[PDB]
Amino acid sequence: ELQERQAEEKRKQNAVPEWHKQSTIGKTALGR
Amino acid sequence: ARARKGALVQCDPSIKALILQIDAKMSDIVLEELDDTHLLVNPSKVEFVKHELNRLLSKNIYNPM
Amino acid sequence: PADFVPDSVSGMFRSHDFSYLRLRPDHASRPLWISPSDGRIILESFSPLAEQAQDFLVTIAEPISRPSHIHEYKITAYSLYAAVSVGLETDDIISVLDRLSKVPVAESIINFIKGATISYGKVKLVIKHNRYFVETTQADILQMLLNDSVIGVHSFEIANESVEVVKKRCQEIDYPVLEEYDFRNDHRNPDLDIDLKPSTQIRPYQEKSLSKMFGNGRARSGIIVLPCGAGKTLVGITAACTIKKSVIVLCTSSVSVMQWRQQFLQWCTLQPENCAVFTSDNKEMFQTESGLVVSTYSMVANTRNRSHDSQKVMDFLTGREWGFIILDEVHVVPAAMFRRVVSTIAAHAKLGLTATLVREDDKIGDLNFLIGPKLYEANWMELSQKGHIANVQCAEVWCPMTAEFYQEYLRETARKRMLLYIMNPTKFQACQFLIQYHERRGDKIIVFSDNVYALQEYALKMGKPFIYGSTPQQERMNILQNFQYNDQINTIFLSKVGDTSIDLPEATCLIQISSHYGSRRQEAQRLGRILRAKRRNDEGFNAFFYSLVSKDTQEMYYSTKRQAFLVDQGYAFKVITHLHGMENIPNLAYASPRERRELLQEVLLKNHPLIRKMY
Ligand SMILES: Nc1ncnc2c1ncn2[C@@H]1O[C@H](COP(=O)(O)OP(=O)(O)O)[C@@H](O)[C@H]1O
Ligand code: BEF
Numbered sequence: 033e034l035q036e037r038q039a040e041e042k043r044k045q046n047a048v049p050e051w052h053k054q055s056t057i058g059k060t061a062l063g064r
Numbered sequence: 065a066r067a068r069k070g071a072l073v074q075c076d077p078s079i080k081a082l083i084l085q086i087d088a089k090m091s092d093i094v095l096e097e098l099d100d101t102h103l104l105v106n107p108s109k110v111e112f113v114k115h116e117l118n119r120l121l122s123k124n125i126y127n128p129m
Numbered sequence: 130p131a132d133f134v135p136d137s138v139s140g141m142f143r144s145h146d147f148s149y150l151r152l153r154p155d156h157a158s159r160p161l162w163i164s165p166s167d168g169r170i171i172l173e174s175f176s177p178l179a180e181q182a183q184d185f186l187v188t189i190a191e192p193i194s195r196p197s198h199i200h201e202y203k204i205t206a207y208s209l210y211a212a213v214s215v216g217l218e219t220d221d222i223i224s225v226l227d228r229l230s231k232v233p234v235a236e237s238i239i240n241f242i243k244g245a246t247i248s249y250g251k252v253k254l255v256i257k258h259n260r261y262f263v264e265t266t267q268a269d270i271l272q273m274l275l276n277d278s279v280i281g282v283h284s285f286e287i288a289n290e291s292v293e294v295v296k297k298r299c300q301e302i303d304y305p306v307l308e309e310y311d312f313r314n315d316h317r318n319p320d321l322d323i324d325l326k327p328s329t330q331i332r333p334y335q336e337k338s339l340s341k342m343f344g345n346g347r348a349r350s351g352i353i354v355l356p357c358g359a360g361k362t363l364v365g366i367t368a369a370c371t372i373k374k375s376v377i378v379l380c381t382s383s384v385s386v387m388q389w390r391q392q393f394l395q396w397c398t399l400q401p402e403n404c405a406v407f408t409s410d411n412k413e414m415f416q417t418e419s420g421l422v423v424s425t426y427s428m429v430a431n432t433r434n435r436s437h438d439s440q441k442v443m444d445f446l447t448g449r450e451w452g453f454i455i456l457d458e459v460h461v462v463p464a465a466m467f468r469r470v471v472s473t474i475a476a477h478a479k480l481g482l483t484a485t486l487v488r489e490d491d492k493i494g495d496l497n498f499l500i501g502p503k504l505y506e507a508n509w510m511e512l513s514q515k516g517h518i519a520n521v522q523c524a525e526v527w528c529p530m531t532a533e534f535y536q537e538y539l540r541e542t543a544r545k546r547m548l549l550y551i552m553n554p555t556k557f558q559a560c561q562f563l564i565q566y567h568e569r570r571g572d573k574i575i576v577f578s579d580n581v582y583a584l585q586e587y588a589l590k591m592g593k594p595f596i597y598g599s600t601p602q603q604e605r606m607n608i609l610q611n612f613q614y615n616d617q618i619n620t621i622f623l624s625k626v627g628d629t630s631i632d633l634p635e636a637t638c639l640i641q642i643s644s645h646y647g648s649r650r651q652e653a654q655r656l657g658r659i660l661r662a663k664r665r666n667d668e669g670f671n672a673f674f675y676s677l678v679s680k681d682t683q684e685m686y687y688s689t690k691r692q693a694f695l696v697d698q699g700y701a702f703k704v705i706t707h708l709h710g711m712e713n714i715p716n717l718a719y720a721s722p723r724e725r726r727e728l729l730q731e732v733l734l735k736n737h738p739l740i741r742k743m744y
C-alpha cells in the first residue's frame with residue numbers, strides 16, 4: 033500500500049496545474 | 065431633471081488613459097468622466113479615435129515586416 | 130510556364146502560383162514539394178522516403194520551420210555552400226532532388242545549384258612554424274592569388290593578420306578556401322594520447338554529426354549546432370580524442386571554463402598532468418609536449434591591458450603552434466574585436482560550438498569565411514519525443530497594468546518607461562503565488578531578471594538568494610551548490626550572467642521577469658536551463674516556462690519579437706489570461722493602495738627626501 037501511495041504521490045508531483053487543464057480566457061483576469 | 069446627449073464608452077484603465085491622452089491633445093474628445101470604467105465622448109470623434117488608437121497600439125505589438 | 134490558362138483565383142497569388150507545372154505520377158510516394166521561385170521546400174513527414182530526405186535536406190537546405198507533420202526547408206547559397214564542402218557535387222544534389230521531388234526541378238533551381246556547388250576545394254591555407262602559407266595544389270593559382278589586388282604546388286606566404294581579409298576576399302572570387310587537416314600524417318606537432326573511456330555513450334545524433342565531419346577522412350573547419358544542454362561540451366572532447374594533438378578551448382565565461390575542464394576529465398582519459406586551465410584565478414600553463422588550455426575570449430581577444438601574470442601566458446599561447454581550437458559559443462566570435470583572434474592565433478583546424486546560430490545583426494553569415502560552413506544541426510522536438518530532452522509546457526502570462534502606474538507610462542520617456550511597467554504590483558502578486566504553488570509541487574524554480582534593481586527588490590522582498598555581475602565567484606558557487614543539494618533553497622533568482630552555459634540538472638520550472646529587449650537568442654538560452662532536468666524520462670514529465678509580461682506595453686512588441694525563434698523550432702506558448710486560485714492565497718504583496726502609492730514614488734524618484742615625513 034505504501035508503494036501504491038508513493039506512486040500516487042509521484043503521479044501528483046508530475047501533474048500539471050489546473051490553469052493548464054483548461055483555457056482560462058473566459059474566467060476573470062488574474063490579480064489581487 | 066436634465067438630459068445630455070452623448071456616447072457612453074466602457075473600457076479598461078489602460079484604454080481609459082489612452083482616451084485621456086487623446087482628450088489632452090484634442091479637448092472635445094471627452095465630455096465628462098463618469099467612473100474608472102466609463103467615459104463620455106463626442107460622437108463625431110468616435111470614428112476617428114477608433115482607427116487612430118489602433119495605430120498607436122501597433123507600436124506595442126511587433127508585426128514582422 | 131507555357132500554355133497554362135490562369136485560374137479565376139490566380140490573382141490571389143502574386144507571381145507565386147505554381148500550378149503551371151505538372152505533377153508526376155508517383156506523387157503519392159515522393160514526399161517533396163519544391164518552390165520554383167523562392168526555393169522553399171515542403172516536406173511530408175507521413176509519407177515514404179521522408180527519413181531519407183530529412184537528413185539530405187538539412188545538409189543542402191536550412192530549416193525554416195519543422196512542425197509535427199509538414200517540415201519547411203529552403204535552398205540558399207549558404208546552404209549549398211555548406212553541403213558542397215562534405216564531398217558533394219552538383220550531380221548528387223540534382224539526382225537526389227529529382228528522385229524525391231513530386232514536381233520536376235525548374236531550370237532556375239538547377240542553375241542555382243550548379244553555381245554554388247563547384248567552388249569548394251581548389252585553394253588551401255596551410256600553417257608551418259607559425260608562418261601562414263597559402264598552398265595550392267596547382268601552379269595556375271599563382272596568376273590569381275599573387276595578382277589579386279588584395280592578396281600580396283606553388284606556395285607563398287601571407288600575413289597572419291590579413292587572414293580575415295583574404296578569406297572574405299576568397300568568398301568574392303570563385304574559389305573559397307577550405308581548412309582540411311591531415312592529422313594522420315602530421316608528425317611535427319606533438320601528439321596527445323587521449324581516448325574516450327568505455328563509460329561514454331555516444332548518442333545517435335552525436336554519431337551522425339561526427340560522420341558528416343569525418344566522412345571523407347579529413348577534419349573540416351566549421352560549426353556544429355546542437356540544442357541547449359545537448360552536450361556541445363562532449364562534442365569538443367570527441368574531436369580532441371580522435372585528433373590526438375594539442376588543442377586549445379575558448380569558452381565565454383569563468384564558471385563555464387570550470388565546467389569544461391571537469392567535463393573533459395570525466396568523459397575522456399586525459400591525464401590531469403597534461404591539462405592546464407587559463408583563468409583569472411590561476412595562470413600556470415602545462416609544460417608537457419602536448420596539453421590543453423581552456424580559456425575565454427576575453428583572455429585571448431583582449432589586446433590593450435593584459436596583466437604581467439597574464440602576459441606570460443599570452444606569449445605562451447602565441448609562441449606555440451596549436452593544432453586545434455575549440456570555440457564554445459561561436460555566436461560571439463563575429464563581434465567587432467573577437468574576430469581578431471582567428472587571425473592572430475595559429476591553428477590548422479577550427480571548430481565552433483553554439484546552441485544558437487542567430488543574432489540581431491547580419492554578421493552571422495560572415496561565419497562561412499571565418500570558421501567555415503555549418504556542418505550539422507539537430508531538431509528540438511525530435512529529441513523531446515525520444516526522451517533525450519524534457520517536454521515543456523510553455524506559457525505566456527498577461528499581467529494587466531495597474532491604473533496608477535500606467536498614467537505615468539504615457540508621460541514618461543522610453544528609458545524610464547521600462548522600469549515603470551516591469552515593477553507593477555500585479556507581477557509581484559503573481560510571482561509569489563506561483564512560487565508557493567510550485568514549491569509545494571516539489572519543483573526547482575528559476576527566476577530570470579535582467580534588471581539588477583528589480584532582482585534585489587524581489588530577492589529582499591521574498592528573502593531568496595540573487596546573483597548578478599558583482600557577486601564573487603566563491604559566494605555564487607556556494608549558492609549554486611546549496612540550491613543543487615540543499616532542500617531548503619528550492620528557488621533562486623538568476624540574471625544575465627546565468628543566461629547561458631550554466632548546468633542545473635535539478636531545475637524543472639523556469640520564470641522570467643525582465644528581458645533584454647527583442648533578442649530571440651537570449652530566450653532560447655534561458656530555456657536551456659530546464660531542458661536538461663534530471664527526470665526528463667519519467668512518465669508524463671512536462672517542464673514549465675512562465676513569461677510574465679505587462680499588457681498594453683512595449684513588452685508585447687519585445688515578447689512576440691524575442692520568441693519567434695522557439696516557434697520555428699516547434700515550441701508553442703500557452704496564453705494564460707487567468708491563473709486559477711490566485712485570489713485565495715492568504716497574503717499578496719502590494720495588495721493595498723497605500724503600498725502601491727509608496728512603491729510608485731520610490732521607483733519614480735529613481736530618476737626633498739627628508740620632507741617626506743610631512744606628507
Ligand atoms: N553523452 C552524455 N552522457 C551523459 N551526460 C551527457 C552526455 N552529453 C551531454 N551530457 C550532459 O548534458 C549536460 C549539458 O552539457 P553541456 O556541454 O553543458 O551542454 P551545452 O554546452 O550544449 O549547453 C551536462 O550535464 C552533461 O553531463
Ligand atoms: F547551450 Be549550452 F547551455 F552551452
Ligand SMILES: [Mg+2]
Binds near residue numbers: 361362457630
Ligand atoms: Mg555549453
